[PDB]
Symmetry: C3
Subunit: 288 residues, 3 copies
Amino acid sequence: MFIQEPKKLIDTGEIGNASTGDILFDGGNKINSDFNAIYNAFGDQRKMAVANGTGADGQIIHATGYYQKHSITEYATPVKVGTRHDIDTSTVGVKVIIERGELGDCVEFINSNGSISVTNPLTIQAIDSIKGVSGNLVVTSPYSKVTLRCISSDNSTSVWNYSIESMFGQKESPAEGTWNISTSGSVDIPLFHRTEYNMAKLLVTCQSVDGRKIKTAEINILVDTVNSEVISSEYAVMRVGNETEEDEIANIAFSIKENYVTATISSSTVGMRAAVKVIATQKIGVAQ
Amino acid sequence: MFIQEPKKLIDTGEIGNASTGDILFDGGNKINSDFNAIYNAFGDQRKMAVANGTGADGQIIHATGYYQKHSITEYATPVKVGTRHDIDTSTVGVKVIIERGELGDCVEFINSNGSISVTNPLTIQAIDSIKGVSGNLVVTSPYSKVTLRCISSDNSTSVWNYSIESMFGQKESPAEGTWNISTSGSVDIPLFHRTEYNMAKLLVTCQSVDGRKIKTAEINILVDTVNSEVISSEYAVMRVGNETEEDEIANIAFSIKENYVTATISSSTVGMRAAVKVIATQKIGVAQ
Amino acid sequence: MFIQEPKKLIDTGEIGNASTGDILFDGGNKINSDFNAIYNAFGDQRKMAVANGTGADGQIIHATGYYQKHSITEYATPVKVGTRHDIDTSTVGVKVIIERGELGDCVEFINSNGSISVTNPLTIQAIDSIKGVSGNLVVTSPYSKVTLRCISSDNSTSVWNYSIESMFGQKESPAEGTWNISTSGSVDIPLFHRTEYNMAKLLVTCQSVDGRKIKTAEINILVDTVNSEVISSEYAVMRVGNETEEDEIANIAFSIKENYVTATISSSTVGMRAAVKVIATQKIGVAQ
């Protein structure tokens, strides 16, 4: 691997005190050291084996950043904080060790070839320990993204915590916000175009400006494109200042309006607010 | 657009072999080429039309990184791997093509002005193909973030996969971990301050140290700030080593303790562990 | 704090017009200005108090990027766009102000020491305003990541929107895609190894190639490792072109096959597609 050297700056404090030969060699090497540190942090380090990362197929600065691809032997020694790794466990699981960190230090991993599995796992050991984990963190989720962050350093108290998430997938939320139920006692909230999703899941919480009346419900909806309708299943309904155990506080209906799956929120109680949030969706794609 | 040139390094191998005129011109241009590559990867490229990205309103290095704003004509030719784009489809949908990549290569998109829609979509074509997609990827989610990653290159097998997520929204989880049910047979788990959310959704899985007794349940809770209470709706309950089809394995209750919405987990079975995870929340904000 | 100066480039347009003394001093300072701008955007700025970020414990380029740790007094003045902050509110809440931005500008925050709370909050004021927020954004979620983005600038119309998410936690999805129900009328979809999770939540939507028959359901499953089985709870079922209100359109079963929790989708209707997506999981870890 390439272990950069800290930042070096040109000592302009000299020059009319050391001739042109020494300042260009002590300056050049300094400029080549820094850039190398920058290009290897945002570029493929494997290219250093050529013209020192130069040439036509040389190193470039990836705006998206870069995740280095190292070998087993290289991971035999603790990795430096701030590095990025694209793990490959196709032939065998790989063990990565992170040097002791300080508050905020970070190391990130990805698995572009999706080799991570239970037989060929990604084992991570963060010098000292990882919260909620006894020993090493064993990652078995293919195509994942792992982020490790030091949440405590001080003296020996060098503890880390982590997050693991999928590199891919449709995770967006087509709608999230708060709307007022107009004086007319009804409000339309467009969620998404009829062609965007087959089903969605949302959370709806209606509350009076005073806070004495409140209702929340979870609703799953199915888009019936053929009949231009939307089926819904409202459950886990909870109410507080409901004057009666009958129809109450706020009603939620669905349909397609202007070609947009839409939520219609109505209420008898004047001055009602309604928070709507889509927390999940499913879209039928192409098999395989 | 600005298409950077690979990394260039100063040939200190010369100097006391080529006078000061040539090494400063061949060196300078080299230093201006690299920096330009770095500033345009982390800065607004549109500024290159001025003093070459210099001056008072010149280019700067964004720690948050930067997402270039290009024109239709510029996107007429395949984009380089590692680039970032802030799409604008307000006047019409825009088609972006990505050059053939290699394992790990990445291109990211965002939609700051939220112009992306079904009529003005973001069409992405990744040289060769995108997994689970027949043809181009058609993005219609406004204010989204799209990440494309090459999961296979080798020879022609240059396939990509993607993720799409919302740029905005409250997605945090106020609590996630595992707690022991004390010998007393009860444990309190603070979830969040009473003022942080109106409703939350959590997953609770209790299992004996031996693994013969286990229960999981999904619970939606509503915060009643006025009465300082919390309503809950527990469903999809599943149990395994339940000695009876009556009350069993573990009970989950909610309330406000020390001003924190809290989960109280109790069980008759000695040596029980309880994993609690909040997977969704809703907070009434200000309309519009 | 360190407020960088815009990009500076070496004026090769001179040299055989200004002797070696002036071009090295005007060039050097230029090279030290740029690098400093780069290292402070991707490195600990607190080190500038030493050998100007040099030496053994000098500044380095973090591939993962870096989040600066500033003081209360420093945050007394508006922060520059593109900066990153690791907030510390252990002693008291901290107020951060962001200078007026332009479309796409971004500022990101993290909370490595998890000091953020309702008593010691992170208050953010984005010059002009933040959508859906009246006044300042008050963040009380510990160990969070806050991203602010300008979604509109033009003249005075400088509005921002935000996202807030947990720095840590298991958020991955072990499976998401679309599969064809083979002519045999049944398809097996492996979700994850039996040891990866105790419970999972998934969304399943089956639709005929023509679109007249469609069903969606939400299912929570519990992994019974001891008996090598999987309990499931299917609910919120919705159907459209169901010829009868009896068993219909598609059945979903679960079990362990080849040591992988697996979903078996079957249907009488020929030519059926089935989208499966795991949207939540829970894994019992180690207490504390």
